[PDB]
Design a protein around this ligand. Structure first.
Ligand SMILES: *[C@H]1O[C@H](CO)[C@@H](O)[C@H](O)[C@@H]1O
Length: 36
């Protein structure tokens, strides 16, 4: 799962896009999306 304050789903990020319970993937920039 994506981590809190970690990148959740940006362009190029092939990692876990689904956040952990209690956190939400929020796109801050097109390439940087942070799980808050
Ligand atoms: C927070 O941790 C997760 C794995 O638990 C990463 O995928 C994420 O990019 C960030 O390092």
């Amino acid at each position: 799962t994506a981590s809190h304050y970690g990148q959740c789903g940006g362009i190029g990020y092939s990692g876990p896009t689904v956040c952990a319970s209690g956190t939400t993937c929020q796109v801050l920039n097109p390439y940087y999306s942070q799980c808050l």
